[PDB]
Design an enzyme around this catalytic site. Structure first.
Site, PDB file in Angstrom:
ATOM      1  N   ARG C 155       0.829  -1.029   0.112  1.00  0.00           N
ATOM      2  CA  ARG C 155      -0.235  -0.042  -0.011  1.00  0.00           C
ATOM      3  C   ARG C 155       0.874   1.376  -0.013  1.00  0.00           C
ATOM      4  O   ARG C 155       1.738   1.051   0.466  1.00  0.00           O
ATOM      5  CB  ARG C 155      -1.196   0.076   1.183  1.00  0.00           C
ATOM      6  CG  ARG C 155      -2.356  -0.602   1.103  1.00  0.00           C
ATOM      7  CD  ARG C 155      -2.715  -1.413   2.410  1.00  0.00           C
ATOM      8  NE  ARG C 155      -3.245  -2.847   1.927  1.00  0.00           N
ATOM      9  CZ  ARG C 155      -2.855  -3.871   2.563  1.00  0.00           C
ATOM     10  NH1 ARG C 155      -2.056  -3.535   3.817  1.00  0.00           N
ATOM     11  NH2 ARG C 155      -3.247  -5.051   2.129  1.00  0.00           N
ATOM     12  N   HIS C 263      -3.712   1.986  -5.647  1.00  0.00           N
ATOM     13  CA  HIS C 263      -3.988   0.611  -6.044  1.00  0.00           C
ATOM     14  C   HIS C 263      -3.473  -0.121  -7.292  1.00  0.00           C
ATOM     15  O   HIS C 263      -3.085  -0.856  -7.283  1.00  0.00           O
ATOM     16  CB  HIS C 263      -5.647   0.501  -6.249  1.00  0.00           C
ATOM     17  CG  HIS C 263      -6.414   0.683  -4.907  1.00  0.00           C
ATOM     18  ND1 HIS C 263      -7.493   1.498  -4.979  1.00  0.00           N
ATOM     19  CD2 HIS C 263      -6.190   0.084  -3.767  1.00  0.00           C
ATOM     20  CE1 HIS C 263      -8.035   1.612  -4.007  1.00  0.00           C
ATOM     21  NE2 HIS C 263      -7.559   0.552  -3.152  1.00  0.00           N
ATOM     22  N   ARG C 266      -0.783  -2.521  -7.264  1.00  0.00           N
ATOM     23  CA  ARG C 266      -1.222  -3.866  -6.682  1.00  0.00           C
ATOM     24  C   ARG C 266      -2.342  -4.592  -7.646  1.00  0.00           C
ATOM     25  O   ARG C 266      -1.941  -5.471  -7.977  1.00  0.00           O
ATOM     26  CB  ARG C 266      -2.182  -3.414  -5.591  1.00  0.00           C
ATOM     27  CG  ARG C 266      -1.145  -3.074  -4.237  1.00  0.00           C
ATOM     28  CD  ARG C 266      -1.870  -2.218  -3.058  1.00  0.00           C
ATOM     29  NE  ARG C 266      -3.071  -3.032  -2.392  1.00  0.00           N
ATOM     30  CZ  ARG C 266      -2.774  -4.039  -1.558  1.00  0.00           C
ATOM     31  NH1 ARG C 266      -1.477  -4.311  -1.278  1.00  0.00           N
ATOM     32  NH2 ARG C 266      -3.835  -4.561  -0.965  1.00  0.00           N
ATOM     33  N   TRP C 289      -3.712  -9.269   0.696  1.00  0.00           N
ATOM     34  CA  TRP C 289      -5.166  -9.345   0.809  1.00  0.00           C
ATOM     35  C   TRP C 289      -5.568 -10.817   1.684  1.00  0.00           C
ATOM     36  O   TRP C 289      -4.668 -11.634   1.763  1.00  0.00           O
ATOM     37  CB  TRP C 289      -5.870  -9.548  -0.581  1.00  0.00           C
ATOM     38  CG  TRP C 289      -5.874  -8.420  -1.252  1.00  0.00           C
ATOM     39  CD1 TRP C 289      -6.031  -7.180  -1.157  1.00  0.00           C
ATOM     40  CD2 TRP C 289      -4.719  -8.136  -2.479  1.00  0.00           C
ATOM     41  NE1 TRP C 289      -5.817  -6.262  -2.176  1.00  0.00           N
ATOM     42  CE2 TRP C 289      -4.862  -6.775  -2.915  1.00  0.00           C
ATOM     43  CE3 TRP C 289      -3.935  -9.108  -3.144  1.00  0.00           C
ATOM     44  CZ2 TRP C 289      -4.199  -6.604  -3.861  1.00  0.00           C
ATOM     45  CZ3 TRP C 289      -3.186  -8.450  -4.092  1.00  0.00           C
ATOM     46  CH2 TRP C 289      -3.370  -7.285  -4.576  1.00  0.00           C
ATOM     47  N   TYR C 298     -10.157  -7.965  -9.440  1.00  0.00           N
ATOM     48  CA  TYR C 298      -8.907  -7.434 -10.123  1.00  0.00           C
ATOM     49  C   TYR C 298      -8.399  -8.163 -11.268  1.00  0.00           C
ATOM     50  O   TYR C 298      -7.866  -7.554 -12.344  1.00  0.00           O
ATOM     51  CB  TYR C 298      -7.639  -7.306  -8.915  1.00  0.00           C
ATOM     52  CG  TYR C 298      -7.700  -6.510  -7.826  1.00  0.00           C
ATOM     53  CD1 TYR C 298      -8.811  -5.540  -7.798  1.00  0.00           C
ATOM     54  CD2 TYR C 298      -6.767  -6.400  -6.763  1.00  0.00           C
ATOM     55  CE1 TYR C 298      -8.921  -4.842  -6.674  1.00  0.00           C
ATOM     56  CE2 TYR C 298      -6.860  -5.624  -5.934  1.00  0.00           C
ATOM     57  CZ  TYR C 298      -8.027  -4.846  -5.738  1.00  0.00           C
ATOM     58  OH  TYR C 298      -7.913  -3.676  -4.709  1.00  0.00           O
TER      59      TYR C 298
END
Lengths: 309, 305, 309, 305
Positions: C155, C263, C266, C289, C298
């Site tokens: 993050r 994001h 990621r 996650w 995703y």
DNA sequence: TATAACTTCGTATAGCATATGCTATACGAAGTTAT
DNA sequence: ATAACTTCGTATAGCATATGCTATACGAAGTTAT
DNA sequence: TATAACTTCGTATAGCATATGCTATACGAAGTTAT
DNA sequence: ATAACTTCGTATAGCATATGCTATACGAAGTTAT
């Protein structure tokens, strides 16, 4: 609580079939020993007094029973109290600590849960190799049962429950069995024949609502039934007989697992699948187990290799 | 405190959009059946007393109903009693016991879930051949549907919602289907056209893909009303009665089950069969492809060398 | 409850650092709108009245906010009440049903959670291929940051938190980073060089207690600090700038995700790992996650193949 | 009701075998430290009032202690209060809050768990070479231990328990070790002998494998008392000080960590590294082999072609 | 200076982790026994 | 009348779920070495 | 008949699953509209 | 004195867990077509 307790107890017995016949069997059992114990000591067995229950648990420990056995009595006791309104003996420091203390000392003293003797692929091949040539109904069945046990890893009670109608087939010619939607268990080409041979020698298929396995009298005649099944006590006999057949009489030590039993095919299959590289979860599912430790216990140079080179 | 529950039924009625019409109907349905049993046996239906409900549940078991059904009943009864300051019947121990007993008891009796009759490639081929060269406006519709179904693996309510514009093109001719996306093979795409023309739903992009076909081989395209799911179910049934005469026939999800299987034989990544019909419970998909031969298990595999 | 409520509230603020600064940020936020709303309607904002809260939720829905946003207000409200003794608005049928109703209609109307634009391997290669040749401090950093983002899937806040001392190395020469024991993240040989180049052009290593990433002024001079970090607001800028660099200005629709953001790396990495055959859980772990749905969203002929042959 | 808790402390003392002496000591230890803080700050230590405990916990945080330690304290305090009709301090909201704050706060400050200094093959080789040809009765003992440790990956308390008869032989010479089984390589097995002879523990099978060695290069075999775990720890430390002079050195589990790693490089089934030191948390073993190069991750793998 | 390049700030909205204790090892260090 | 549905009622199968937080998204306004 | 081959029975002890509802499809069948 | 531990006290790391059931294990005693 008063009439409430008598009522809560009364509700239980009414819908007693909400529990397994074995739970009831054990409840009554533990109660008989609990009362017997209370009796011999001038005590009120119900409701149970914590300090009394503690004394009782220490008494079973002292009688040399297994930690899991002592846990059972304590448990049934707890079941009887919760289910009836009153507080459970496990609710008191005395019972709770003594249990944990009892568990600790036994384990510390080396006591460990006995494991069943494995009935593996090799054993199956040998048994098959020998009984394969019998015409005896008794044998054609026994061989067909061991094959199913091994191939499927189904508890003996699950096998004893199988009904003819529960037998599908696959496009391969491979037999299939439903265990209550439920679960489908596919037999190999070789085992399906074993089962085919027993089905054709007993005429159990004369009624799809008949149980696949049935008793076979001394005169080699099957006794199919759709109401009664072969006692799991007997499915255990098939396992013990086949072992005597090959290794003869059990040493009179009296210990458990000196011959094959209900677990045998299950525990044995778990190993073959291991040595064959099967995935741990794969194994788990097949055996119906929910945990990784059960399958692990059943299977038991790393560094000795790194060093030596 | 009767005002307390009154306020709650007002709450429930005011925000009824919190639930699907479907869900509601099942509820009214349960209250309907329960209430009647109560009248017949002179018991107060509301609030439902545990012993009364336990008796009711024992009654449904005799009706021969499945556990998932009896639990539906116990469940809805549990819903409103909670959505009212009332204790849910499952909160009694008498009902908890019967629900538990009813279960084991029923499984022991031999409780088996329903099995959907699969509509595999083999059946699609046989149906294609049979009504491939037909002119009946309906037959053309029915085949294009049997196509969209086995190809998209879509649910019926979903196919009934398809409009003329959710379609997109992408490769050699084959179309694509926007959804609440899908790709159609070429063989089926050739089918879903003959229907579009001899139906003239193209005439208006708002019109739904599938529509009514009165007894005169004449289609009634429309963008307001759509073919009922039951109608789509009837196409599966009819088509069956066509081949075998009058879960014995095909239903709205025979195509989904059949596609998973056919795929499972050409061996397909099991999660890749979740793309098929948007699934979970890797097991449900298993409960379909179970009696397949590639799903025999390691044991079978090990035993056969 | 009375002084109790004022006390429970008082305990919270004392040990307020038991919660994330963002939770507090949102609490106060939702409270401002809740009070604003109550005010404009002649109502008591605390304690909150169920029917009032319902009206409020329907008011936000009507304002066109996102279902997850409406869920937030309801949540903070619930947090404020539980944490202070009183019953939560979610405790009343009115709030609970309206929420579910609000959720249903929006979703039924097509509203769906917006997803970020992916910053994948290709994008990285291009960005790298372009900025690789800059001597500008600003660029050497930005390229090194994107590389870390992509390689690690950490993050933006986790990257902004990285301290020089947190940088181990491997016997390979490959850099390693600890995120608070915690977790070790290994950079490839190529990214380690990118980071090596930025470390050597800013002199952040002049103090192991300094943050790896720091601001770089208009005159190409780094401003290392061990007390202050680069705002995640800025790490988001690096993402947006690099995108403008390649695709130019964002269409004035105002919508989210028309450029790369926190994001991006990621979500982008999750895809490359997919297409490359990586295992789903493998992916999960790397991205930190806990669930399979986040990684699945995703990433998004089967039958079209079977048929066509 | 003071008789109520009195009865409970009697209960606790009567069945104290329910817990390990170790566990107890930690408890007395906590009560000791807490009580003192209470005296020093004039607060009633029993029953412990939430606000008092919260203040205490905030105190330990200043002491500089780790979260796992402060939780140890909060935990033991929570134990006896529950094993007495008293409310546990964690059942207050003030303590729940501080424990939560103390955590985040501490992690933010930079809380890192301790790192065990690994004793890999490379170090074993270096130590072997260094004291391979030594006669000092101790050195021989120390090497055979460093051997058993890195080979069996056993815990120290476990090695201290080894007797002369837990040993079995199996292949070419190498012995086997019964346990609470293990296999030793040939190289190490050759070591664990020189110790057995020049110690004469063989003289009695009850005697423990490892024993004391007074300053006179003279071993004191025995089957009653065993080498303390701390002593075994000292062998790891000493051996280090020997090579590098005075978690900076080696400890009781440096051999376990080192073996996992060395194995991890020769690439070893991760669960097959659980056989090593009977592990769980596939992660703990990871927390050891983390900075390894084969544990870089798919990302690294993908990025480098 | 004008200005890049931020930091801070408030509202909107997406992405997660859900435990705690018992028992072992850590490691400085006071305590003990035989050289 | 009847094909071809649609609407009904109720049976039963297939899919994710609830909190309670904590973190990013991004326009805009405030800040500081140049 | 004596007897294999069980079944039942009681105490000892090992191996498990921990959910429930909302919403969709099922399917006979009464209700409806245009041939 | 001092090597070589052992015993202490307290810090902190590494392992599974708790119920509540339900099912097998096996010797022995009771049952039925032979």
């Amino acid at each position: 609580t008063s009439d409430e307790v008598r009522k809560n107890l009364m509700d239980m017995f009414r819908d007693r079939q909400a529990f397994s016949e074995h739970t009831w069997k054990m409840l009554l059992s533990v109660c008989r020993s609990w009362a017997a114990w209370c009796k011999l000591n001038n005590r009120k067995w119900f409701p149970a007094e914590p300090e009394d229950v503690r004394d009782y648990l220490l008494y079973l420990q002292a009688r040399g029973l297994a930690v899991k056995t002592i846990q059972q009595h304590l448990g049934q006791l707890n079941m009887l109290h919760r289910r009836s309104g009153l507080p459970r003996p496990s609710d008191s420091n005395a019972v709770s600590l003594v249990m944990r203390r009892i568990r600790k000392e036994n384990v510390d003293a080396g006591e460990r849960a006995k494991q069943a003797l494995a009935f593996e692929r090799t054993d199956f091949d040998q048994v098959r190799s020998l009984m394969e040539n019998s015409d005896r109904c008794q044998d054609i069945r026994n061989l067909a049962f061991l094959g199913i046990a091994y191939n499927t890893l189904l508890r003996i009670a699950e096998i004893a429950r199988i009904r003819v109608k529960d037998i599908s087939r696959t496009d391969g010619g491979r037999m299939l069995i439903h265990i209550g939607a439920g679960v489908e268990k596919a037999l190999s080409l070789g085992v399906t024949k074993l089962v085919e041979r027993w089905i054709s020698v007993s005429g159990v298929a004369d009624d799809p609502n008949n149980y696949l396995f049935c008793r076979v009298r001394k005169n080699g005649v099957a006794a199919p039934s759709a109401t009664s099944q072969l006692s799991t006590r007997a499915l255990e006999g098939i396992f013990e007989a086949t072992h005597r057949l090959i290794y003869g009489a059990k040493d009179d030590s009296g210990q458990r697992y000196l011959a094959w039993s209900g677990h045998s095919a299950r525990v044995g299959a778990a190993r073959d699948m291991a040595r064959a590289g099967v995935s741990i979860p794969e194994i788990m599912q097949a055996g119906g187990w929910t945990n990784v430790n059960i399958v692990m216990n059943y299977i038991r140079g790393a560094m000795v290799r790194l060093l030596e080179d």
